[PDB]
Design an enzyme around this catalytic site. Structure first.
Site, PDB file in Angstrom:
ATOM      1  N   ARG A  96      -0.761   9.988  26.572  1.00  0.00           N
ATOM      2  CA  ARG A  96      -1.520  11.387  26.457  1.00  0.00           C
ATOM      3  C   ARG A  96      -2.551  11.031  27.619  1.00  0.00           C
ATOM      4  O   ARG A  96      -2.999  10.119  28.020  1.00  0.00           O
ATOM      5  CB  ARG A  96      -2.184  11.225  24.968  1.00  0.00           C
ATOM      6  CG  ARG A  96      -1.984  12.552  24.460  1.00  0.00           C
ATOM      7  CD  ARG A  96      -2.579  12.870  23.301  1.00  0.00           C
ATOM      8  NE  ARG A  96      -3.524  14.009  22.975  1.00  0.00           N
ATOM      9  CZ  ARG A  96      -3.899  14.393  21.955  1.00  0.00           C
ATOM     10  NH1 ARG A  96      -3.632  14.052  21.064  1.00  0.00           N
ATOM     11  NH2 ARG A  96      -4.754  15.614  22.107  1.00  0.00           N
TER      12      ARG A  96
ATOM     13  N   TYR B  74       0.920  -1.095   0.091  1.00  0.00           N
ATOM     14  CA  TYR B  74      -0.219  -0.024  -0.227  1.00  0.00           C
ATOM     15  C   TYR B  74       0.824   1.432  -0.076  1.00  0.00           C
ATOM     16  O   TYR B  74       0.472   2.356   0.442  1.00  0.00           O
ATOM     17  CB  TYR B  74      -0.992   0.140   1.176  1.00  0.00           C
ATOM     18  CG  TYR B  74      -2.224  -1.193   1.052  1.00  0.00           C
ATOM     19  CD1 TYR B  74      -1.718  -2.251   1.815  1.00  0.00           C
ATOM     20  CD2 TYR B  74      -3.061  -1.072  -0.038  1.00  0.00           C
ATOM     21  CE1 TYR B  74      -2.895  -3.284   1.725  1.00  0.00           C
ATOM     22  CE2 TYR B  74      -3.826  -1.974  -0.048  1.00  0.00           C
ATOM     23  CZ  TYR B  74      -3.687  -3.350   0.613  1.00  0.00           C
ATOM     24  OH  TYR B  74      -4.743  -4.488   0.549  1.00  0.00           O
TER      25      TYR B  74
ATOM     26  N   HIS C  26      -0.319   2.757  21.218  1.00  0.00           N
ATOM     27  CA  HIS C  26      -0.469   1.905  19.925  1.00  0.00           C
ATOM     28  C   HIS C  26      -0.790   0.627  19.932  1.00  0.00           C
ATOM     29  O   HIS C  26      -1.583   0.100  18.939  1.00  0.00           O
ATOM     30  CB  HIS C  26       0.542   2.483  18.827  1.00  0.00           C
ATOM     31  CG  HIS C  26       0.943   3.709  18.510  1.00  0.00           C
ATOM     32  ND1 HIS C  26       2.248   4.054  18.403  1.00  0.00           N
ATOM     33  CD2 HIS C  26       0.323   4.710  18.285  1.00  0.00           C
ATOM     34  CE1 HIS C  26       2.422   5.406  18.118  1.00  0.00           C
ATOM     35  NE2 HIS C  26       1.043   6.092  17.939  1.00  0.00           N
TER      36      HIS C  26
ATOM     37  N   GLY D  28       6.159   9.759  23.588  1.00  0.00           N
ATOM     38  CA  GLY D  28       5.634  10.317  22.449  1.00  0.00           C
ATOM     39  C   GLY D  28       4.343   9.478  22.196  1.00  0.00           C
ATOM     40  O   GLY D  28       3.339   9.647  21.268  1.00  0.00           O
TER      41      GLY D  28
ATOM     42  N   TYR E  22       7.513  17.716  20.238  1.00  0.00           N
ATOM     43  CA  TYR E  22       7.827  18.186  18.996  1.00  0.00           C
ATOM     44  C   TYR E  22       6.728  19.004  18.594  1.00  0.00           C
ATOM     45  O   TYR E  22       5.455  18.757  18.706  1.00  0.00           O
ATOM     46  CB  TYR E  22       7.781  17.242  17.599  1.00  0.00           C
ATOM     47  CG  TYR E  22       9.010  16.152  18.127  1.00  0.00           C
ATOM     48  CD1 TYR E  22       9.186  15.134  18.713  1.00  0.00           C
ATOM     49  CD2 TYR E  22      10.365  16.797  17.474  1.00  0.00           C
ATOM     50  CE1 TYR E  22      10.198  14.146  19.233  1.00  0.00           C
ATOM     51  CE2 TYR E  22      11.518  15.947  17.909  1.00  0.00           C
ATOM     52  CZ  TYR E  22      11.509  14.847  18.891  1.00  0.00           C
ATOM     53  OH  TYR E  22      12.358  14.235  19.238  1.00  0.00           O
TER      54      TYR E  22
END
Ligand SMILES: [Cl-]
Ligand SMILES: [Cl-]
Lengths: 276, 277, 277, 276
Positions: free
Chosen positions: C171, C17, C138, C133, C190
């Site tokens: 988060r 993909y 995830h 991060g 960032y």
């Protein structure tokens, strides 16, 4: 995260692919057959009457057009198909004409080749069983050997009562394979007045033809349909085997007697077997 | 390469997903509707007859169990649904009973909410239009505003004649969202005698509930998924008014009884009866 | 019929993909990380050096921007990630700078959280393991209990030497769930100078938040989707303790500062520092 | 409701299909090539040296095995592929050997046939461009005409500097089509010591062969790989056309001069063209 399982419907919701651009074009295809040829009707009626057939099973009846003729001609017809999607049109027609005594008597039911014996209602079983229009070719060979073709045939065969007929056909795949084309306009049963282009795809697996896939273009839009390429020699053997060779068997090419090596090349082979 | 286009059938071949494990279990679900509760029949029949309803439109009629009752009670019923898969069972029934005069007169046809006006036959439009069993919640909100809900409703409304009823319900999504459960056994119309477990999945998009999906296990143990739009009471009521331009009388039942904001008893379903003025 | 099996490549052919509109926009996202904020660098470098960290493991190193800093600051870094697609950019960088001694010594390898112990090379295990991060989010919870979260954590923990740090963040999912928004521009590590809109989708399964999915539009207007497990503060903290058998000291920062329950300022990220005892 | 867009990765998450049972078997396939044949090396080195090639472009380098040889033999090699998935193994190897001066000098980059001109770095362009192992056959004809084959070839051709070589090959599809089989063990470049069975599928569209799909069985597991069936006469014309016929062109069959009608049937045809 599909919102509903594949194959489940919902009150006031179109079934999964009803709305698709291929479907609403496929229904133009399924219904462009409204023009039986004179020569077909003359042959079929002729054959069923010659052998004294009254109770007839029509397998894979689709929209029921062949069945509707039989009903109109005085026969005792039960008509089956696996496809609800097409059975719906037959059922419709019966209903509009439910008022005519012949149509009250017309039996229409769901049935699958693989379990035909359990599916169909009868006792004795039929005077003739008809499977015409090349419907048998719809049945794929997913297994690998032809174990599904063997079982389907033996189920259809079992519908035929001693002295009765199986009348069943195939497009000329011998010719298709050798030219590599399945061209349009070649239906001997129903003539279309619809313009079409067809792409022919032949799939050969391990040196044995395995599938013929037709991509139709017919307002311009595309649908696909697929077929098992039954060769004449092989299909003949398959048919014999369904009866245990306790059958007589002849071959027509486009309604006329067929002789190996004749110069005229038929569009369809039609097998008529009588159980002995 | 698909061997046939999605949505095309073949003489002697099962349609695409007919033999799948979820289908042949969904049919067990969709034919559970076989034990109408007594107070449903007594309320529906009572309302229709109070308002002098003869001609009834049943929208999303499914297997036609609610329609079959109406025909049996003397009403002039037409029954529609978009699902061929379900309309099949109703058509079957009519056929078996095609010999009884009432069933000869029962009209059954294909219709889609999005085009309902074109689809249904009539002139001039029904005494009552009934859409019960929470079917309206089947309609998703794919476009994001509720533009589809607006059109559907407006189309159903349009079927209602001057003086007529729209009778339409929703499971209690207020309760569902606040407990995060849509538990089994709660149908007020038909009682199941089938054991089930339900997983409830609530989808919230940008702070607004957008979908409730239910993953059923049924007791041979098999699974299926069914999805719903979470219509809240305050909202659905506005949506219904809007389908009539406010030129309607509207009342709200909770489980067949008059519903009053703040009452203590929490209803399984809200049922809206509107009369066009 | 697929012409090749899912996940197999062909000499001179793009992998499955690679050329899709979402990919060539995702790469724009994944190379936004190019403006380290000043107080991030000053806090990280400060912590590692306070605890005398020389050997560092960077888990889910992505393009390796955090690793590149560490190497540049004199640390002995090994960097891992399961994603070949991302590890590609780090490997590239190392190669361009293969001429500087520090970069010759930088170890970069493939690893999966589920097998981290087998995958990483070392003996005996790092001064500090950093996973920053919000990458840990995830990892989905497909099995339903959190059995995978348990194993991953336990594996990361195992990389930590006696006396060493695990430095790992999330988060603020508490805030996210309660406002139902994960808005853009909030990265404390960032800063983007890219304009974005975000749709936030919260999935609740049987009354427990199970997934937050974010559908980005970026300003040429293009779209991509990214998904997260909603780790709440109380829960994640327990999970981290459990990875060490409670044989650890643990503290919680909110946006680089000590965090105190009930304070008024609501942090974008919680960052957990644990020292193995 | 996919949880992430097709083709996006996630820190500490395996890319979409990395874990699949076909992948972890496909990597056994991609790496069973660790046995260059003596005859190959002798031929290739021989040809590049005969024409005085120093700077070589290796297209579709895969794991870089052919490139690694060239680097070891003293050439100035840049190596490209479209597949990150395979380029990863070449890049690895370079890195382990980054300490040897030859390997410091080895250029490895991403490139796609369709944009080869923009992708590769050089000025002058290469003394020889090699595209060996039947990689060109990987490129499908989705369009219908062969407009992609024409463009890819003209891009590869453009890499060849005046007096330079294009050395490019195809499995013998003439033989494949006529027997209907692509049997295993036939690699002339690398010999496998892996046992395999192969199912051969030939797809013919509108009477022109269009795809050959190989289903491998190799602990027993399945992968699929697909090919465009380039016939010798046709491929030759395609190659000429890439140069505008301003090229001399010879054909080898398994490293030996090939003569139409010879009795020995080659497994691969190898085309060497010099730009004039
Ligand atoms: Cl009445
Ligand atoms: Cl240091």
């Amino acid at each position: 995260y599909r919102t509903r399982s594949l194959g489940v419907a919902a009150e006031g919701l179109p079934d999964q692919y009803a709305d698709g651009e291929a479907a609403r074009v496929w229904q133009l295809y399924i219904g462009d057959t409204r023009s039986r040829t004179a020569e077909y009707k003359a042959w079929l009626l002729g054959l069923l009457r010659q052998h004294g057939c009254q109770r007839v099973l029509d397998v894979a009846c689709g929209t029921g057009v062949d069945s509707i003729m039989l009903v109109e001609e005085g026969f005792s017809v039960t008509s089956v198909d696996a496809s609800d999607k097409m059975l719906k049109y037959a059922l419709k027609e019966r209903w509009n004409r439910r008022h005519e005594p012949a149509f009250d008597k017309w039996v229409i039911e769901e049935a699958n080749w693989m379990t035909l014996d359990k599916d169909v209602p009868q006792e004795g079983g039929f005077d003739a069983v008809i499977c015409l229009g090349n419907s048998f070719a719809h049945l794929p060979d997913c297994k690998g050997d032809q174990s599904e073709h063997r079982l389907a045939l033996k189920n259809i065969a079992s519908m035929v009562r001693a002295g009765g007929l199986l009348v069943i056909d195939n497009r000329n795949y011998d010719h298709i394979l050798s030219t590599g084309c399945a061209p349009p306009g070649k239906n001997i049963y129903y003539k279309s007045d619809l313009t079409k282009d067809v792409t022919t795809s032949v799939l050969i697996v391990n040196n044995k033809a395995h599938m013929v896939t037709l991509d139709y273009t017919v307002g311009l839009s595309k649908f696909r349909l697929s077929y098992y390429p039954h060769c004449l020699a092989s299909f003949t053997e398959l048919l014999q085997a369904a009866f245990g060779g306790k059958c007589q068997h002849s071959v027509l090419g486009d309604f006329k007697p067929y002789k190996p090596g004749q110069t005229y090349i038929p569009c369809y082979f039609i097998h008529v077997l009588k159980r002995t």
